């Protein structure tokens, strides 16, 4: 049963084209819309089709952001196309994406169920690729706004990670306000909880930090039951922020007096067997002061990732590591001196 549509390539002649596909099956529903799996007739390759109810004459943000991106660690937009329901002006936007079978969420939950901690090699591999994709999108001023294990797609054979779901994403423009109630609660940066509208892409780094911590703990580090409870969970680890840190988070917020709580030691937050470099990296990510957090490129260069730069490294499944060092100049834009660390001798 062949479905055929006129679709426009994601990148990027812009010229429309007939696209045929088969085996259409639902893989997920939600308040955003529907995601299907399908098989391209033209090459047999598997695709995901994200169907969203979309209203012209307004731009779709997700669409515009996705048409700009071409990166090994970001889910590729192959095609997009509009379709109509049947109820007059009922229009749907369809994003055709490369299908990726697993998620960091599903893999972590599998290890957690079997009462195993995720092997540290996979922690380094997943996190590194996450930061690489972050460096990439941030170089365009694009902030994902919804980093979480469920949004990290995984090929379980190659261990390629692909960032997906740009439905919360936005090109941040300094001076133009952004909405505060954003991100999934457990991964939401404290400045967001404090109501900031002038935040930067360092909110993704905080979320990345929460993914790291979660992989080390086998569960979410900040499992808040509500918005207020989220700050509570954070205070349990970071303690209360200083007047200076509050100003850095949201200059339009002031609280004269409050009971001080001291930070819980990072080495006690994680289990004794947690690699010290992992804890160290984490402590540089989960900071109140947004400008104090590592940039994604700095994070890639952290010593926690040194094993990945070893010429002899292997996946536990015997395979070679995926491409880790094929950095473009666009990727290295924010900080070229880091190429010394980032591209190891054997990879030049």
């Amino acid at each position: 049963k062949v479905t055929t549509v006129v679709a426009t390539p994601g990148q990027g002649p812009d010229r429309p084209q007939e696209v045929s596909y088969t085996d259409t099956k639902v893989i997920g529903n939600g308040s955003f819309g529907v995601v299907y799996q399908a098989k391209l007739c033209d090459s047999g390759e598997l695709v995901a089709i994200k169907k969203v109810l979309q209203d012209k004459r307004f731009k779709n943000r997700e669409l515009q952001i996705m048409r700009k991106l071409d990166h090994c660690n970001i889910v590729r937009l192959r095609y997009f196309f509009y379709s109509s329901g049947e109820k007059k002006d009922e229009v749907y936007l369809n994003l055709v994406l490369d299908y990726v079978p697993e998620t960091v969420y599903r893999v972590a939950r599998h290890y957690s169920r079997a009462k195993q901690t995720l092997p540290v090699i996979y922690v380094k591999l997943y996190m590194y690729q996450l930061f690489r994709s972050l460096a990439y999108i941030h170089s365009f001023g694009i902030c994902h706004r919804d980093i979480k294990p469920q949004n990290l797609l995984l090929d379980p054979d190659t261990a390629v990670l692909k960032l997906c779901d740009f439905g919360s994403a936005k090109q941040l423009v300094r001076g133009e306000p952004n909405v505060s109630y954003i991100c999934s609660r457990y991964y939401r940066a404290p400045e967001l909880i404090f109501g900031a509208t002038d935040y930067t892409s360092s909110i993704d780094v905080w979320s990345a930090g929460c993914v790291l911590a979660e992989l080390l703990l086998g569960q979410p580090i900040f499992p808040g039951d509500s918005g207020v409870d989220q700050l509570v969970e954070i205070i349990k680890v970071l303690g209360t922020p200083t007047r200076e840190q509050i100003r850095e988070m949201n200059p339009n917020y002031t609280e004269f007096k409050f009971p001080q709580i001291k930070a819980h030691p990072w080495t006690k937050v994680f289990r004794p067997r947690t690699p010290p470099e992992a804890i160290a990296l984490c402590s540089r990510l989960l900071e109140y002061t947004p400008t104090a957090r590592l940039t994604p490129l700095e994070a890639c260069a952290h010593s926690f990732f040194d094993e990945l730069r070893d010429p002899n490294v292997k996946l536990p499944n015997g395979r070679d590591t995926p491409a880790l060092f094929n950095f473009t100049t666009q990727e290295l834009s924010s900080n070229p001196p880091l190429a010394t660390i980032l591209i190891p001798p054997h990879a030049r």
């Binding site: 404090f194 918005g227 509570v232 917020y253 609280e255 007096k257 009971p259 709580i261």
Partner: peptide
């Protein structure tokens, strides 16, 4: 609703600490 109100009134931290000591 509640988070918004504590933000605007400047009572967030106070309220969060109180909840931690329940």
């Amino acid at each position: 609703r509640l988070l918004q109100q504590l933000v605007l009134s400047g009572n967030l931290i106070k309220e969060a600490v109180r909840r931690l000591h329940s």
